[PDB]
Amino acid sequence: SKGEELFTGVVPILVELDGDVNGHKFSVRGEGEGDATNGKLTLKFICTTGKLPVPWPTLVTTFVACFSRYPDHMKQHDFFKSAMPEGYVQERTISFKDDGTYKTRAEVKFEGDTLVNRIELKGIDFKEDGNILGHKLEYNFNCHNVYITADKQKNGIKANFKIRHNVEDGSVQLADHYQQNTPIGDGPVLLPDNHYLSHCSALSKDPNEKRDHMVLLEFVTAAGI
């Protein structure tokens, strides 16, 4: 309806993250474009404080489900666009198996014509020579399905899902995601039936960027059970 109309074209995106992980304070700024018609996101992120203290792949899921492609038969289940323009809060705990935890709180909303994802992150209990602080994760990303359910209690959605990061030694690092989203505004939103968002992502580098950075391409499509 009104919310969907905001995504019919290409939408500029701004991402801002302030983080602290095991006492290391850092900031990231990203920008790019979303094309929800094709479920497509393109973003480039720069660590504005120097070297990023964690591997870039561990922040991919933190750095805009409103750009997912919901097929015609599923448009009644698109909570994320229905909350726009006032937006939604996205909160996660990400538990890295046998390692530390991230806690994140983000607001995703329009600021003028730009879709803005503004995030605060706190990371604790990381091992000094684990896969995260030891920078042992490969610079790549796998496809994942995220099971989305309506929150039985709070006018939003929830998702619990496993993310798997390839490690340089051939192993896999699991990151258990616990997610809740709630609208910022008081207007009516769409509360979905159980469904999936299927994600695939590709990471790359800008050959002319001297700062620590990540280029991200994501494709996301909704699918029913």
UniProtKB/Swiss-Prot annotation:
Listed result of changing residue 63 to L: In EGFP; increases fluorescence at warmer temperatures such as 37 degrees Celsius. In EBFP; gives rise to variants with blue fluorescence
Keyword Glycosyltransferase: no
Tissues where the protein occurs: Photocytes.
Post-translational modification note: Contains a chromophore consisting of modified amino acid residues. Maturation of the chromophore requires nothing other than molecular oxygen.
Domain of life: Eukaryota
Effect of residue 220 to R: In Azurite; shifts the excitation and emission spectra to shorter wavelengths and increases quantum yields compared to BFP
Coiled coil: none
Keywords: Chromophore, Luminescence, Photoprotein
Mutation effect (residue 198 to F): In H9; increases fluorescence at 395 nm excitation
Result of changing residue 171 to G: In GFPA; leads to enhanced fluorescence at 37 degrees Celsius. In Venus; leads to yellow fluorescence, improved maturation and reduced environmental sensitivity
UniProt record, GO biological process: bioluminescence; generation of precursor metabolites and energy
Known outcome of mutating residue 142 to I: In ECFP; leads to cyan fluorescence, folds faster and more efficiently at 37 degrees Celsius and has superior solubility and brightness
InterPro entries: GFP (IPR009017), GFP-related (IPR011584), Green_fluorescent_prot (IPR000786)
Applications: Green fluorescent protein has been engineered to produce a vast number of variously colored mutants, fusion proteins, and biosensors. Further generation of mutants led to more stable proteins (at 37 degrees Celsius for example) with brighter fluorescence and longer fluorescence lifetimes.
Effect of residue 194 to I: In mut2.1; shifts fluorescence lifetime from 3.03 to 2.50 ns
Complexes and interactors: Monomer.
Family the entry assigns: Belongs to the GFP family.
Purpose of the protein: Energy-transfer acceptor. Its role is to transduce the blue chemiluminescence of the protein aequorin into green fluorescent light by energy transfer. Fluoresces in vivo upon receiving energy from the Ca(2+)-activated photoprotein aequorin.
Record-given protein name: Green fluorescent protein
Organism: Aequorea victoria (Water jellyfish)
